[PDB]
UniProtKB/Swiss-Prot annotation:
Posttranslational modification: Phosphorylated. Phosphorylation induces conformational changes by increasing the affinity of the N-terminus for C-terminus, resulting in inhibition of its function thus decreasing its binding to microtubules and DCTN1. Exhibits a folded, autoinhibited conformation when phosphorylated and an open conformation when dephosphorylated with increased binding affinity to microtubules and DCTN1. Phosphorylation regulates its recruitment to tyrosinated microtubules and the recruitment of vesicular cargo to microtubules in neurons.
Domain characteristics, as noted in the entry: Intramolecular interaction between the zinc finger domain and the CAP-Gly domains may inhibit interaction with tubulin.
Species this protein is from: Homo sapiens (Human)
CAP-Gly domain span: 85-127
Record's protein name: CAP-Gly domain-containing linker protein 1
Function summary: Binds to the plus end of microtubules and regulates the dynamics of the microtubule cytoskeleton. Promotes microtubule growth and microtubule bundling. Links cytoplasmic vesicles to microtubules and thereby plays an important role in intracellular vesicle trafficking. Plays a role macropinocytosis and endosome trafficking.
Range within the parent protein: 1 to 128 of 1438
Source superkingdom: Eukaryota
Region annotated Important for tubulin binding, chain positions: 104-108
Length: 141
């Protein structure tokens, strides 16, 4: 019960600093001849894709998580953990994850206390134990 905060906040900006509003400029036709990549491949002689390198994914004693990892809340909600620890409203361990869809409840803030900056209806506070790696369930189909 000693290892707490050291120094004074986390002074680690991002990089680009100037914009202070929202917008989407670009109403012209053809600006620069910029080509994209080709994630696909030639398939004329039948057979598509490859598929081979499979993963085992062990269970182990799941009793901890790390910030900046993809997890599935309730085994059906992919998101990124932003907060990991105790809250300022309820006594216990919580995890502020950021969902990838407008199906959340909180916005990463409780009673004004900002735990992790995220988009509305995405930042939910749930127990890490509830989180799961990748989607998985019964063997029905």
């Amino acid at each position: 019960g000693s290892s707490g905060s050291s120094g004074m906040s986390m002074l680690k900006p991002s990089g680009l600093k100037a914009p202070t509003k929202i917008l989407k400029p670009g109403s012209t036709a053809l600006k620069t001849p910029t080509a994209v990549v080709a994630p696909v491949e030639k398939t004329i002689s039948s057979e598509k894709a490859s598929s081979t390198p499979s993963s085992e994914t062990q269970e182990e004693f799941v009793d901890d998580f790390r910030v900046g990892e993809r997890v599935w809340v309730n085994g059906n909600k992919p998101g990124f953990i932003q907060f990991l620890g105790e809250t300022q409203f309820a006594p216990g361990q919580w995890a502020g994850i950021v969902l990838d869809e407008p199906i959340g409840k909180n916005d990463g803030s409780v009673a004004g206390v900002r735990y992790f900056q995220c988009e509305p209806l995405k930042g939910i506070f749930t127990r890490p134990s509830k989180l799961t790696r990748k989607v998985s369930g019964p063997s029905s189909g």
